[PDB]
Symmetry: D4
Subunit: 162 residues, 8 copies
């Protein structure tokens, strides 16, 4: 039973969003992946957002580049937490993606993560921390993961070559 959905406005966003999925694979969290566009498939987005709850999703991670409307439009149609991932656009290096996602006016929110791939991974981690709140097992895996990332740095203090 997938409790988290990863959507994006175009398959060209997959080079970025694959990092969110990679986190779910490492953490063994079931997840659904799909290309949904508020701009190119407006009706499927509405349909998708309206059935998000009945489908069992507790968190939705939406990525888009440029004038990103996907995240906000999904949020406007559901009470399921939506996390936004700014994909790096060619011309404005994701700054346009960032502003169009994070600058939501009062009433409909979207938790936004960093521009690009680091944000893809983080949105998955954030979604995982949200679920772990009521899943002791995942919570344990999440703590194992953090343990690993920390010790990796600790056991490798000197950046210089031997």
């Amino acid at each position: 039973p997938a409790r988290v959905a990863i959507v994006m406005g175009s398959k060209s966003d997959w080079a970025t969003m694959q990092f969110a999925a990679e986190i779910f694979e490492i953490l063994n969290v079931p997840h659904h992946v799909e290309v949904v566009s508020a701009q190119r498939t407006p009706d499927k987005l509405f349909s998708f957002a309206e059935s998000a709850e009945e489908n069992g999703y507790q968190v939705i991670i939406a990525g888009a580049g440029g004038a990103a409307h996907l995240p906000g439009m999904i949020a406007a149609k559901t009470l399921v937490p939506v996390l936004g991932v700014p994909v790096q656009s060619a011309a404005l290096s994701g700054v346009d993606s960032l502003y169009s996602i994070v600058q939501m006016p009062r009433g409909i929110p979207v938790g936004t993560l960093a521009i690009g791939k680091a944000g893809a991974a983080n949105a998955a981690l954030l979604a995982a921390q949200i679920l772990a709140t009521h899943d002791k097992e995942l919570h344990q895996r999440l703590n194992d993961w953090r343990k690993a990332q920390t010790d990796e740095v600790l056991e490798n203090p000197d950046p210089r070559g031997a």
Copy 2:
């Protein structure tokens, strides 16, 4: 028969969008004004956009501030030309409004005008020039208007006080 519609995401946008309407009043162009929000009234926006053509609109002028989704969402649902007006937001002085409107990816366009009030007036003028293409009378009024703005500057070359 109103051939142009002026929508905005919030009545707080009216302080800006009133300048678009002022142009239509001066040019005697019938127009419809309404607050439609892709974020707060998503279903009314869909309904609105889908019936835009059958309603007789040939141009739509949409204004929004911050992460502006209104313009793009309307454009995604209709073939009626959509002109975007970036409303000046408090924190980013409309830069977030501008990027979220103008940076549309390939497939669904939005002709964007200047940030703020000057853009409101211009979107109305642009819409008027679009209609004048098949309305000799309005075309004449538009030329009278341009004549007036030009001569006003011409007959007042010295900015200094007498």
Copy 3:
């Protein structure tokens, strides 16, 4: 039992963060408010973050202006979801607050909301949607709230004065 904590780097941030609390009051969600600074009270922040879970918090909302370190430092010390609120700084109008919060590298996330007051309210709404996932009652209040914001716009389509 407060399941959500609202922290900020300075009481000068309260003029902004009060809007997050206002949402919790309207939605009748118990909440804890406190001024914690990663910069001025580093030890209390560590202590605070480390005991967040044992204290019962399921979401933490942290606001800061300028070079905002509070959100990221709390996130680095706990698995409790952290939502960041960029407070509007004088010189860079919150852009420095925004970048220092949202641009977290891979490993420790922070769901970021809009700059300023609109972001304060939204972070509370987002936190509320996170909790509502396992609280049918709050979920109902959240839907009542959205219903109200939508109908308010619907029953007031003409921005012009009567």
Copy 4:
């Protein structure tokens, strides 16, 4: 009879503007292409703009990079709708192109599209939607095109490799 003109300040802009023309080819819309510069061929621009109407153009698409003056200067000389396309400049990645085109003060407008190639295609699509208003056939082709772009996404929901 070409009802739409595509101009640009330099043939170096063609790598970008070719995408506008590609749309007209797909949609079978007659079009004129020409390099006109307000900066390097000021007199030909005036001559060009002044005869735009008598030449039968109903829409003009102008692309320029850097301090783009072409779009605004054409608009100042004709009532024919002008759509601006910000070409990506080396140093400012088209941000200078964008501001010099979209930030027109009150009186002479220019509908601006996205920076770069996506904007080139969109300006053509926008111009096509303007013409389709009084051309049922093109309107039909435009709807066929949108149908195709939408179903392409719909019939390919999973971005992952088989």
Copy 5:
């Protein structure tokens, strides 16, 4: 015989451009002031630029705000040195004025000064230094002026109140 001309796109620019004129008054340099707009009075601008040399102007100072086209259009039509002054716009605080003036592509230049009033004064000073090259008297006044500005600072080293 006025050897320097001060033009601007609108009399609303005078609040800024008056500082350029103030320099000429202090330095006793004859000068012509006039509101010329490439956008609102395109033909008068052409006429103006084409006759600049025969009129005796050796330097032209042009100020404009927003998408400033005035400076570049004048430069495109004459060999008389053109200095640009970015007027502070409301929304983008003159950044749009700055980019549209300074970012001229190869072939037609415009020496650009600071945004706002400080730039107005400086463009006049720069123009004065250009003329002083072949005017020993003005050159002397210019050196007297610099002497005065320097000693004013020198004879007042402590910013604190007595």
Copy 6:
């Protein structure tokens, strides 16, 4: 007798500044080239600026990247017109170069040209137009050059391949 000097803060700036010199070669204008740094050779800069007039220079073109101090420091020490050329820096793509050059406060000016190579060529053209004011021959060559750049565009209107 070289009437114009081209200086730069580092020989790494030559890849850019060579375009200014190329203009002088085409226009047959004697010129001096030299690497002077306000930061690395402060005393030689002072010495250089103070003797600029006695050396016969009527215009100085200074290029620098990053926090560019060269142009302003030269201007502070001489009455000889100084034109600034923002060299494209790695991190901020010349935006830091641009602001540190153009944003001079009241009293000491610097005519600034576009970021990068296009600005290098233009500063040379601008300097040439300044000299041509009292050199009919160069003025003629300058007009021949403009004639050539214009006709090149005119005789090549179609950007498409034959």
Copy 7:
């Protein structure tokens, strides 16, 4: 014996730089204040920088707004540590001040603090920490100060009114 000097390009900078001095007063650190401009008093700056060491200064704090050259020019002439303070400019809100100070190329550094007043205070604190390295007494006062700022926050955790 003043071991730290506070300079600024104009007495108009005092409204900002007074906060640096306020720190020295609280910490009882002798200090010299003076208006020195690289742009308006270039020779006094050279003289000043060259004698900084023989005068006993161990740290220099320089503030400037707009295209700030003061900090860098002082650093180029002395080995005494120079700390830069970006004064908030009207048009670019200190962003131009910031880039012109912090973006120093390799060879001559300037430790830069925050834009505006907070940066003024911090540069003084940083200078104080530099001196405290070889002054146990000041080091003690610095620790008393930090103690006070921390406990002030600690003993006032609830931002709300009683």
Copy 8:
């Protein structure tokens, strides 16, 4: 006895921070290098900062990219001068690194250097100038170094190829 410490948030920062170390090697200044992350190794950072003084460090140079918290967190925990180095991030080219480091509010400072490698070298030079204050020998080496960089430019005035 190493009197200066060079830390960074990740070994991926070494490609940049190696330039700081290179300066210490040339100047023969003992130094400690280590990867410390406020985000990934929060406890080791605290431990590290708290023992900085007892370890003999008189200056700390911290580099980080993106939302850089390392510098500020170290500064919050020690009185040892901290110099920040903005590492160039992929998406925002170090602008996010710069703002998150330099924009520290009143109370805890961080002397910030240029974005990237030039800043790495400079922070080392600045730290060296701080130490040289009480080390005549290093002070001499520092002056030898500056002598060399200056004469290198002086003895190579013509950037052109022989």
